[PDB]
């Protein structure tokens, strides 16, 4: 579910927020993206990649 | 099967400067447009790096260098290779490179990549050898003289078959490939990167972050390592398999990692483009 | 407990442990060497005694 405030569980990482399509290009060995505050601000979908 | 190579001219060891190379991604977390400070085993900036050659210069005396010494493995190794004919074929890691202890072997067989953690009775002069047939004008793998015996083999991995053309290319070094080897908590961490480059003499100057390649669960003690190269044989260079060989032009640079704090710069695309050694 | 599986009436001696090591093992390190351990000042030559 995108563009809506949801609880999410991505590969065991739980949280709450709004998921939108991202322009970030993750490297193949990367699953999560983190900002200056170490918070998970980007995530690779385990199914759609 | 072990062969003790001869007719090697004695030269003093060579040293060079690692300007900003050896930086790798500390973790697997995407970061963009950020300055991230991290403490890890990094190669210090502008460090004194040992330099080894493989070249057969024509002449009366000339130089016939085939440098495969047993170098220390203190806390981590930055290994750069400037090669064009795929001379650097792999490495062996261990403490006593014989059957008493277990050793890791990462080699390229020109058909597969073999990673074996096992008790190897390594040769005093381990290497590989490619024969050049004049009739075919073709290069074929013919010699594998890394170890004499292998026993109590605990870890084995063979990659999918490939070709890995073995032609003795002439001219400029067309491939700079960098590795970072670490041995932490029973894990052999390998980070790798490759850049085209175009030069003849020294280690390239620039910045290129190494990406995580593999984490081998070997669980062995490593204090020394030796590079396995490939020599060339053909209708030229006659001999008794100890002098009848020539070395394709290649070079490799070895530096040592230390616990350092680095300030890395992640651009808008998540690529580490610069670093500061604090 | 695996007494019903790993125990033999005459004694199960197929399970071994390392005694007399020179130094403590590193985390997740495996030592399978069978070299004779020298406890005293007299050096061994591959013979137990
Ligand atoms: C570690 O290697 C030992 C040596 O293997 C033998 O010698 C090699 C050179 C090669 O020829 C190989 O084919 C041989 O089998 C293994 O064998 C044991 O070695 C001890 C000598 O210290 C000897 O007394 C044992 O009879 C011999 N056992 C066997 C089955 O060959 C080790 O095997 C294990 O360790 C032994 C202590 C014993 O518990 C044996 O049952 C085990 O299988 C190897 N250790 C490993 C693989 O952990
Ligand atoms: C890992 O291997 C090294 C080298 O084989 C070990 O260091 C040796 O330790 C012994 C006594 O423990 C000394 O007599 C040697 O002089 C040491 N050699 C070197 C090169 O340091 C080291 O102890 C091993 N580590 C573990 C955890 O077993
Ligand atoms: C294994 C071998 O003998 N390589 C020889 C090559 C080959 O003949 C060509 O690369 C392929 O034909 O020619 C040389 O003059 C060269 O270029 O340095 C000498 C060199 O020893
Ligand atoms: C399963 O995950 C893979 C990603 O590895 C994806 O390509 C595929 O579409 C997924 N299948 C379903 C039914 O979601
Ligand atoms: C090569 O030379 C070394 C010199 O110490 C020797 O120990 C070794 O046995 C030699 N190898 C062969 C195959 O003769
Ligand atoms: C690097 O070390 C060698 C000896 O270990 C020394 O001769 C050389 O001068 C050093 N390089 C620099 C740039 O100091
Ligand atoms: C290299 O080794 C692999 C596995 O050990 C083998 O399948 C392959 O044929 C070898 N290549 C050679 C000897 O050129
Ligand atoms: C030429 O190539 C064939 C197969 O590619 C090989 O069997 C043959 O041995 C080669 N020629 C020589 C002289 O080895
Ligand atoms: C980031 O990537 C985009 C598209 O891949 C590219 O146009 C841009 O130049 C890149 N930025 C940098 C700093 O490399």
Swiss-Prot record, chain C:
Residues 19-49 are annotated as: Disordered. It comes from the Viruses. Residues 12-20 are annotated as: Immunodominant HLA epitope recognized by the CD8+. Residues 1-49 are annotated as: Receptor-binding motif. Changing residue 47 to A: Increased resistance to neutralizing antibodies. Changing residue 10 to S: In strain: Omicron/BA.1, Omicron/BA.2.75, Omicron/XBB.1.5, Omicron/EG.5.1. Changing residue 39 to V: Increased resistance to neutralizing antibodies. Changing residue 48 to Q: In strain: Kappa/B.1.617.1. Binds to host ACE2. RBD also interacts with the N-linked glycan on 'Asn-90' of ACE2. Cleavage of S generates a polybasic C-terminal sequence on S1 that binds to host Neuropilin-1 (NRP1) and Neuropilin-2 (NRP2) receptors. Interacts with host integrin alpha-5/beta-1 (ITGA5:ITGB1) and with ACE2 in complex with integrin alpha-5/beta-1 (ITGA5:ITGB1). May interact via cytoplasmic c-terminus with M protein. May interact (via N-terminus) with host bilirubin and biliverdin, thereby preventing antibody binding to the SARS-CoV-2 spike NTD via an allosteric mechanism. Attaches the virion to the cell membrane by interacting with host receptor, initiating the infection. The major receptor is host ACE2. When S2/S2' has been cleaved, binding to the receptor triggers direct fusion at the cell membrane. When S2/S2' has not been cleaved, binding to the receptor results in internalization of the virus by endocytosis using host TFRC and GRM2 and leading to fusion of the virion membrane with the host endosomal membrane. Alternatively, may use NRP1/NRP2 and integrin as entry receptors. This is Spike protein S1.
């Amino acid at each position: 579910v995108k563009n809506k405030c949801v609880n999410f569980n991505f590969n065991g990482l739980t949280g709450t927020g709004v998921l939108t399509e991202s322009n970030k290009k993750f490297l193949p060995f990367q699953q999560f993206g983190r900002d200056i505050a170490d918070t998970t601000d980007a995530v690779r979908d385990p199914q759609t990649l | 099967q072990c062969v003790n190579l001869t007719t090697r001219t004695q030269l003093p060891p060579a040293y060079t400067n690692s300007f900003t190379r050896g930086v790798y991604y500390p973790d697997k977390v995407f970061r963009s447009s950020v300055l991230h400070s991290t403490q890890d085993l990094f190669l210090p900036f502008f460090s004194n790096v040992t330099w080894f050659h493989a070249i057969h210069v024509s002449g009366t005396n000339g130089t016939k260098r085939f440098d495969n010494p047993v170098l220390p493995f203190n806390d981590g190794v930055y290994f750069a290779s400037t090669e064009k004919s795929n001379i650097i074929r792999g490495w062996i890691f261990g403490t006593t490179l014989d059957s008493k202890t277990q050793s890791l072997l990462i080699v390229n067989n020109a058909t597969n990549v073999v990673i074996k953690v096992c008790e190897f009775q390594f040769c005093n002069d381990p290497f590989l050898g490619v024969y050049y047939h004049k009739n075919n004008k073709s290069w074929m793998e013919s010699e594998f003289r890394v170890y004499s015996s292998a026993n109590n083999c605990t870890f084995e991995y063979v990659s999918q078959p490939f070709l890995m053309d073995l032609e003795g290319k002439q001219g400029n070094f067309k491939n700079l490939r960098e590795f970072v080897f670490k041995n932490i908590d029973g894990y052999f961490k390998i980070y790798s990167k490759h850049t085209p480059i175009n030069l003849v003499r020294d280690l390239p100057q620039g910045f290129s972050a190494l990406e995580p390649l593999v984490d081998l669960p070997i669980g062995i003690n490593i204090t020394r390592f030796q590079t396995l190269l490939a020599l060339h044989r053909s209708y030229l260079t006659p001999g008794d398999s100890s002098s009848g060989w020539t070395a394709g032009a290649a070079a490799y640079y070895v530096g040592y990692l230390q616990p350092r704090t680095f300030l890395l710069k992640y651009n808008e695309n998540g690529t580490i483009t610069d670093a500061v050694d604090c | 407990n695996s007494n019903n599986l790993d125990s033999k009436v005459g004694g199960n001696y197929n399970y071994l442990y390392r005694l007399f090591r020179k130094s403590n093992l590193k985390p997740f390190e495996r030592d399978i060497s069978t070299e004779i351990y020298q406890a005293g000042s007299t050096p061994c030559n591959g013979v137990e005694g």
